[model samples]
Target: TGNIYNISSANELNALKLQPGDKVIFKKGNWKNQQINFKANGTKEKPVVLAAEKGGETIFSGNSNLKIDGNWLVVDGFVFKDGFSEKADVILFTKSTSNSRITNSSIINYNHPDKTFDYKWLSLNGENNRVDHCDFTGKTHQGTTLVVWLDEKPNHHQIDHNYFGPRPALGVNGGETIRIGTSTWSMHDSYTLVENNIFDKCDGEMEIISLKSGHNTVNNNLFYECDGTVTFRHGNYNTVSNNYILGNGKKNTGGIRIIGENHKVFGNYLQGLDGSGLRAAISIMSALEKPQLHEYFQVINPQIVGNIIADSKEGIDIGAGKNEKRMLPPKDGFLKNNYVINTRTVIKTENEPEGLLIENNQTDASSLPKGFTKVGSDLVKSDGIWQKKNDVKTPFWKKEKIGPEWNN
Candidate 1:
């Protein structure tokens, strides 16, 4: 058995020399104005643990934050609320850390009073880290809620089973719920995986999950009543698959927006969205002719396949955001086997794309586009999900457990 250290203060916790299989518990109480820098090294088989004495009872309030440095560490069951990070992130996995995790925790309503003081609630900087079964909500501030900081090397992080709750619009550009990387590091390969999460009423901005680096995968998540898209804002060779984006008659609710190269969007279900133009159900954007690293790049060889869009205001918008400055349309794009039903506009094209293949797409709209074949396939409801008859796949929302077990 590893040594169990019951700690009550940051000084007491930081002074200890931790070993593998050690457990350090924060005593249950209100912890305020404490900046914890937890540093240690452990093995994969026996990681060092830092947890609350009682789950959800060790409250961290009033200028409290944590920085984790080293390897194979775990932080669990703490709550950060009624306070805000001044300049640094609320929880940071430092650049030197690896194989670390933070699970079964909650950070709610932790916002700076200035609202312009930008800082992430969580910043993941290391490799092979996992953040799962957590809860994040009510961040009405300037920066993104969670960020994955990428360097030259790939960070194969896993973010799963978390619940992202409502955040009102920040009315600016830096209000994403989760941003994987920055445009400066967009060309780098992150190889991150984000799956099996729930985003509910997170109307922070136009983008809920912004993928800005190459070779990432986002799958099997649920976006419920959120007024934004899962945007491929930059990067290449990324995948967004098998997600449920349900608007449920909400205004300005969007599905996915695509930009950049060699991306794949498939096997998703979208319904009841009212957003259009850039916020359309599926928007393949136009690109700047001479784009900088931060500017929108031309979409190349994108594959949109086997998706379902039902009862939406608009379906797919090819060549979206086309204008004088953004005149370059998508090239070598393929749209196949997609099903669109009861949509106002099935497919809207701003500029005709080059070598775009649109085939085997079925829609039951009032007027079919040139590439789509009209079909009268009826949708059947099962297990709180709508699916085509005889083609029912198990809903991802029912297949995965989300958020902390204690939260519900």
Candidate 2:
């Protein structure tokens, strides 16, 4: 609720003075080659808004970019179309911008033909910002799509109800769809919530949603035909729960991979995964060397519970990695009450770690763990879809579509 300032073009915004209780409206149509740098401060009760006058009609095309540097702002219902930037990202939350939001927007075909010089679609550099109900598609280059940059303090951000579309593999590293933090700030706690998003065919590279900081929650999301897993590459005390991951007959599609300490993987539904080792349906990595920021940390106190794995080549793998040696494995790794069906190998391990509890799991494979039970019926179920409440606005994201075709 604010004072509305209507502008028909990007140049008309130059005379506007933004303040608290201010709403800047972008007119309906295509806006091309205009770098929208909206900066202003607002309060929690009175946030500044930059949105389209009509929802889903304002399309930003060409070499336009957006940088929101102020606090308590909201950017809503604006769509980005066919943009490219070689020097900067398409959107950035910079200069310690706190308590802001970017919601109900759509970005399609923000790509470059060079395929060189990594860039990001959204790079969050501030604290306590929220990006939700957005639609993203057609990212065909290097670098990740969304990244949350962490400093010393906890950046309490929420990314929810967005649609991340297909990106073919770049044949190398640094092609993740969403990365929370980098290795430099790996020790910090992000306090991030990535929930109810649809990752449809996000085959960029390994680690689809990489949790690089501590104290994050990725829950109730859908990963459809994504070639990688939700990997906890450099984090501690993160929770991955109630997520549906359907490989849908993809060859290299994988599931969750755990590497850090005190991570919780529970209530996830994984089916039709053909990958093994690091790309197994569920893998707990080994730590042969000392704990460093660049290397894998020794997994401590990992709890895997109530997950359902169906029609995968490999099931639970402990101490498995690409080429790393296993000097020490996961200690006190608790595996309990999981349901596995028609998997080739149920439980595989590199080293017999100390104090590992494998209990009450149902599987049909030859390599069953200790105290495992063979059941007949299906005891686990997942919704296999994402749904939003109708009370929320943003008609583009409120509807339900499972796979990559939702970009239309």
Candidate 3:
């Protein structure tokens, strides 16, 4: 038999003696300054659950704080709303937590747009924790919505099936919808998996879903009318595949901006993009000598495979970057088996990028080269256009992948 405790305030939560197989529930009311500072460990078979009395019945209304430092725990069905904070993170999975999850939750209108301060709403500082099936919206503020804080060890966390709603353009950088790791921790291994999420109107500045560490997978997600692209800002050996990246003809909307070594892009569809330069449907950026984590690193051994690019400002731009003069041009890239349609330009090179093997790409425009077949027609109206299906089936090329939803 397990114990069930009920608490309504921070004092009551602090005074309770928690144990494994226990369920601690917050009362159904508006909570303020009610920090849930839980620190305990539970077993896998009998994990402790911290939840609302009823699913979403407990509301954290204002100036809330949370720090869960535990293992084998689950925090679910809580509504974090109408809050602002300048000093502390609104929610935190502290460094001691592992094998934990924060799912089926919501964070809404947690805005402090006037302050220049910064803090993430959900700061994940532990390994193997998941933030999924959550709804995050109305964050008009100075920090990222969610972040996976990396350290020396790997955080094999899973971020999937969440609804990331509108975050208006911050005009400058640093206000991202979701960021995996920081630049200082870029060299650290964070084998994080980001998949199956819907980024609906996530217009927070550039660099949406910034992949900052290596050995990560982003697949099967849908980006609808977002202003920015998925940037491999740091690290290497990351894969972005099976995604539906549609700009819907929004100005300054982009697809994928690739960086680092051995990074792979494949089996995706990019349509209605209108951005140019680094915001092309597929941009192979020129590198720089700066080796700092926040600075742009060189692109080496990158591969682009089997993607369909249509209605973008440019199909693929080699040596695409902010500055072409001081930047080191990308080399040894393999762009193969791709289709481009209705883009104004097929390829635009700033400086001569060396060792680019462009083969078997189809475009009706007379600019790009043919790799396998030279046949070029209006692919948007072609009878062999890719169709959408809803059943769970393995992709044609790779099976071990993330983010490939059957119905999208």
| TM-score against truth, every candidate | 0.97, 0.91, 0.90
Let me know the TM-score candidate 3 reaches against the reference structure.
0.90
Alpha-carbon deviation at 30 in model 1, angstroms: 1.7
Query: Lowest summed lDDT over 10 consecutive residues: which window, candidate 1?
Result: 376-385
TM-score of 2: 0.91
C-alpha-based local distance difference test score of model 1: 0.91
- What tens digits encode model 3's per-residue C-alpha lDDT throughout 3-82? 88888887887887778898888888888867778776788899988877776678887777777889988887787786
Query: Over the stretch 1-408, how does candidate 1's per-residue lDDT look in tens digits?
Result: 799999988999888999999999999999898898889998989999999998889899999998889899999998999999888999999999999999989899999998778999999998999999999999999999999999989999999999999999999889999999999999999999999999999898999999999999999899999989999998999999989899998999998999999999998888888988788888999999889979999999999998889889999998899988999999997998899887888889997899989998988766767778877676676765667788787776676668887778
Best by TM-score: 1
Q: Rank the candidates by TM-score, best first.
A: 1, 2, 3
Q: In candidate 3, where is summed lDDT lowest over 10 consecutive residues? A: 399-408
What Cα-based lDDT does every candidate model obtain? 0.91, 0.82, 0.78
* Tens-digit lDDT string for candidate 2 (1-408): 567998866676667788899999998888888778778899998999998887778888888788888899998878778778757888899956999999878778788878866889888887889888787787888899998888888988888878898878877888898999988888889999998888989988988999899999999888889999999999799999988788986989999999888999997878888889899889988885666697788888899998888888888888887354557788887988887778888878876666878888887766566757887544433343211222123222245542223235
Q: Judging by lDDT against the true structure, name the best candidate.
A: 1
